[PDB]
Design a protein around this nucleic acid. Structure first.
Ligand code: TTP
Ligand code: CA
Ligand code: CA
Ligand code: CA
Ligand code: CA
Ligand code: CA
Ligand code: CA
Length: 903
DNA sequence: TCATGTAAGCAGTCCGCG
DNA sequence: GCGGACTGCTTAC
């Protein structure tokens, strides 16, 4: 088998590499790497090396990496460019693996762990680590085993061994419901004292050294806690045994409320699952506790225990250990669904970077582009410093706020990367400039053609049409992978709807789910078999279809994110290929493309409908247009339709057969106008939206830019079993809106769009009447809490203190002297509740850590003093007033002359 | 919230306002 | 008690 790296580090003049050899064995080697850099030389001098602009360079081969670094400093002082890859471990990986890496994940040791630490005096700070580690569960992907280290004797209590038999039992029978499928995989190890637990854990770590180290919050808690605890007991040299190269870097973030550390373990790639999740999931959660995220992702219940966690080990050691094990497993279950570790490995090896560098699109692209250029014997430019400079982005149309009955939307495929490819935008493809007209003149095709020789953007830039740019070339590769995976995702999505339709008429039989690949549209024969399946089998199939969809979603959306990352990297000062001419060539072209096609669509629909000057395009943002389809429906006549699906079919065909070809002709003209290298402006139909036929539903509405709601019947070719709300920007979409209010507002919207005003009024009246009965957490607002210190003047609010920060200060004063009260953490999210006048907290609101119950000592007072009137007004009524005034509807029946009668 | 980019909405503070 | 200038936060793309 072909070899592949696991980890790489630079330590002085040495590269330390862990890798898999040709026999599939894990090996480590220290290499005195001899790096090369480059300097421009005279044209007369023969060389195989050229910079990206075709200028000759000489290779400087250095005896060591320090020599190479010192040369860079001297060149800077002389004032000459020092070219080539200055991150030597990237150069090393490129030299060592000069081929497309095929990796075997079964050889890569992926470790997932979490620790428990009983603390009778508040949160156990990793930087201090003054309390015993009393449990560790460490799952090893190669052994497929959960290694459980259990401390039986501690200054905070001596306890009996944990029971696997009791652990497996149902919670309703006094057990802990440790899942049956991992019971056989647990290796339990009790210890009579902390020192032997920790020594054994280190010995174990040596035998089974993680390559990828993950878990929930491991970077900020478990790793620095373990490191500092070992350091305190045994000394730092023993702590450094956590690094296969015995090298660590400790970085301390000082703060007004307490300092914390992050530990770099040389020779390990730490991918904290919370960071993976935040980067790759495309959610914004109100809380990032594992309980909340597990509930969100897996629909499993909160891990219930009585009393504080500081007393759980002593009162119920049995459950304490089971919960530690289950928490480790939950992360594994989320990853089985989401597949972020797989993605990280895919991306890391593709780029030839340290796996942890997947978090940085700038590092990722620098490596991809370096490897690409190196193949052609080309030499990369030196990284330069630039001042931060704002620059223009996309265009967003101002919509007329209103209800909109029938809407069809259209969207450009992968816009920014497509612009890069179409225009041929790269550092080395720049051909010159042309004198710009106002953008409006290009949009309306009155400006003179920019060039009949080069490929142009309306920002004034011209590019070579005949040479391949490294940026377009490498962006195309990832785009094509993105396209493949999005195909698999949409197929699984369509397949899911086939199963949902078949669930309306399940069969009374004992059968099994069909063995099929959900990444491909079901054949006619499979669809026939599905129509005869039982509910049990259909439900299992739907689960499998949805899991396939989620895997496709992970794969496509993050490759989309990577290529989009390159377009913005051009406008980031730390990017080697930073250049506002290119960043701006992209965004400006986008602005033109959107407004050009709005004109073309308005022109086309007026023509086919036999009118002039009517505005069909009602809205657009960046690369999308929203087309009012009312006149289309009216041209044929509503009564001509049998049911909802008939008019949806009609509009789907109208868009594909009439509109899309006109859209294509429009963009082909624009491509000729700009003399671009390749036509890649592909704008396909996205949503078909409207009210159910024969209903009083309004179909959709806009309140403003980035704020709208649509009742969607078909999305990108997925014909839904049941209509689906597409809501953008409104409070239902914001993580700061209370959970129960999101729900109530969404149903208000559903009623407006599908049923009409009277239905809305009925629901509003009910919610208003019942809302005081909702659980306090469900009606609490949420906010991130940044710069808490700045506004903290002797426990009271300073000037311009934000509302949520005021709530934290109110909380801090309320929990003073209470050692068991959870502290609010800087930068994390809080629940927020307004308080009534005269409350014992002495202020207008309170805030506490999100995803938790407020501490029992002040909970009673919070419930008593909650200002429901204010909560309803601010979070529910005011947003709803926004939706309904825009929609020209009322949520309350208003007074009229009819009130004089007894109805 | 350690990690490409800009556009742009709403909540809230402070200030003005016979 | 509402509007403008300002920060903070969050979402759409
Ligand atoms: C969603 C998103 C878009 N953008 C930019 C780049 C996109 O090309 C542009 C349009 O956004 P989108 O239309 O959402 O995405 P896309 O055109 O790149 O991909 P597709 O429509 O095929 O799914 O806005 C970002 O920079 N960051 C983002 O998170
Ligand atoms: Ca725990
Ligand atoms: Ca798009
Ligand atoms: Ca059936
Ligand atoms: Ca879009
Ligand atoms: Ca599309
Ligand atoms: Ca109390």
């Amino acid at each position: 088998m072909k070899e592949f790296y696991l980890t790489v580090e630079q330590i002085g003049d040495s590269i330390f590499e862990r890798y898999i050899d040709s026999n599939g064995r894990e090996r480590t080697r220290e290499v005195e790497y001899k790096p090369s850099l480059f300097a421009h030389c005279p044209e007369s001098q023969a060389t195989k090396y050229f910079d990206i602009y075709g200028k000759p360079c000489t290779r400087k081969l250095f005896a060591n990496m320090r020599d190479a670094s010192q040369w860079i400093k001297r060149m800077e002082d002389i004032g000459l460019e020092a070219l080539g890859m200055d991150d030597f471990k990237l150069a090393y990986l490129s030299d060592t693996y000069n081929y497309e890496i095929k990796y075997d994940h079964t050889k890569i040791r992926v470790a997932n762990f979490d620790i428990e630490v009983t603390s009778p005096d508040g949160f156990p700070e990793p930087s201090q680590a003054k309390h015993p580690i009393d449990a560790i569960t460490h799952y090893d992907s190669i052994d497929d085993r959960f290694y459980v280290f259990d401390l039986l004797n501690s200054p905070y209590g001596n306890v009996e061994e944990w029971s696997i038999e009791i652990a497996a039992k149902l919670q309703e029978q006094g057990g802990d419901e440790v899942p049956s499928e991992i019971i056989d995989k647990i290796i339990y190890m009790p210890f009579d004292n902390e020192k032997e637990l920790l020594m054994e854990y280190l010995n174990f770590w040596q035998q089974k050294t993680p390559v990828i180290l993950t878990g929930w919050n491991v970077e900020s808690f478990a790793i620095p806690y373990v490191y500092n605890r070992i350091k305190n007991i045994f000394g730092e040299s023993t702590a450094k045994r956590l690094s296969p190269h015995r090298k660590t870097r400790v970085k301390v973030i000082e703060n007004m409320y307490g300092s914390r550390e992050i530990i770099t373990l040389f020779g390990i790639s730490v991918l904290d699952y919370i960071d993976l999740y935040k980067k790759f999931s495309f959610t914004n959660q109100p809380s990032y506790s594992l309980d909340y995220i597990s509930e969100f992702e897996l629909n499993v219940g909160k891990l219930k225990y009585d009393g504080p966690i500081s007393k759980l080990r002593e009162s119920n050691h049995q459950r304490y250990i089971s919960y530690n094990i289950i928490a480790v497993y939950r992360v594994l279950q989320i990853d089985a669904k989401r597949q972020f570790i797989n993605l990280s490995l895919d991306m890391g090896y593709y780029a030839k970077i340290q796996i942890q560098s997947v978090f940085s699109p700038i590092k990722t692209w620098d490596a991809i582009i370096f490897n690409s250029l190196k193949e052609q014997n080309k030499v990369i430019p030196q990284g330069r410093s630039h001042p931060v400079q704002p620059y223009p982005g996309a265009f967003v149309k101002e919509p007329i706020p209103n209800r909109y009955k029938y809407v069809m939307s259209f969207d450009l495929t992968s816009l920014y990367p497509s612009i890069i490819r179409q225009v041929n935008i790269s550092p080395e493809t720049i051909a010159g400039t042309f004198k710009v007209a106002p953008l409006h003149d290009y949009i309306n095709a009155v400006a003179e053609r920019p060039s009949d020789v080069y490929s142009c953007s309306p920002n004034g830039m011209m590019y070579y049409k005949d040479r391949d740019g490294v940026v377009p070339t490498e962006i195309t590769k990832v785009f094509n992978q993105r396209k493949e995976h999005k195909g698999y995702m949409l197929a699984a999505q369509r397949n899911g709807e086939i199963i949902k339709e078949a669930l309306h008429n399940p069969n009374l039989s004992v059968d099994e789910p069909l063995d099929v690949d959900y990444r491909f549209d079901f054949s006619d024969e499979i669809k026939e078999k599905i129509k005869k399946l039982s509910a049990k089998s259909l439900n299992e199939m739907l689960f499998r279809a949805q899991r396939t969809e989620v895997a496709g979603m992970t794969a496509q959306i993050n490759r989309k994110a990577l290529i989009n990352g390159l377009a913005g990297a051009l406008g980031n000062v730390w990017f080697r290929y930073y250049d506002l001419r290119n960043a701006t060539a992209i965004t400006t072209f986008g602005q033109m493309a959107l407004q050009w096609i709005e004109r073309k669509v308005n022109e086309y629909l007026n023509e086919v409908c036999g009118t002039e000057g009517e505005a069909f395009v009602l809205y657009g943002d960046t690369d999308s247009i929203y087309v009012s389809a009312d006149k289309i429906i009216d041209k044929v006549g509503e009564s001509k339709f049998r049911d909802t699906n008939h008019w949806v079919d009609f509009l789907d065909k109208f868009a594909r057969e009439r509109m899309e070809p006109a859209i294509d002709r429009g963009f082909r003209e624009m491509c000729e106008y700009m003399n671009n290298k390749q036509h890649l402006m592909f704008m396909d139909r996205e949503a078909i939206a409207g009210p159910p036929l024969g209903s009083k539903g309004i179909g959709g509405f806009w309140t403003g830019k980035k704020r709208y709601a649509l009742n969607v019947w078909d999305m990108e070719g997925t014909r839904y079993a049941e209509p689906k709300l597409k809501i953008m920007g409104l409070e239902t979409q914001k993580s700061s809106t209370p959970k129960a209010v999101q729900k109530a507002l969404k149903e208000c919207i559903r009623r407006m769009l599908q049923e009409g005003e009277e239905s809305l009024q009925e629901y509003f009246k009910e919610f208003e009447k019942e809302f005081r009965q909702l659980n306090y957490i469900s009606i609490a607002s949420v906010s991130s809490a940044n710069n808490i210190a700045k506004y903290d003047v002797g426990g009271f609010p300073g000037p311009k203190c934000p509302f949520h920060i005021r709530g934290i200060l109110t909380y801090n004063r309320a929990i003073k002297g209470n050692i068991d009260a959870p502290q609010v953490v800087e930068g994390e999210k809080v629940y927020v509740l307004p308080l009534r006048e005269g409350n014992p907290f002495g202020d207008k609101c309170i805030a506490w850590p999100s995803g938790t119950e407020i501490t029992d000592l002040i909970k009673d007072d919070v419930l008593h003093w909650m200002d429901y009137t204010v909560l309803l007004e601010k979070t529910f009524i005011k947003p709803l007033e926004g939706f309904t005034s825009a929609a020209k509807l009322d949520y309350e029946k208003k007074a009229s002359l009819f009130d004089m009668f007894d109805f």
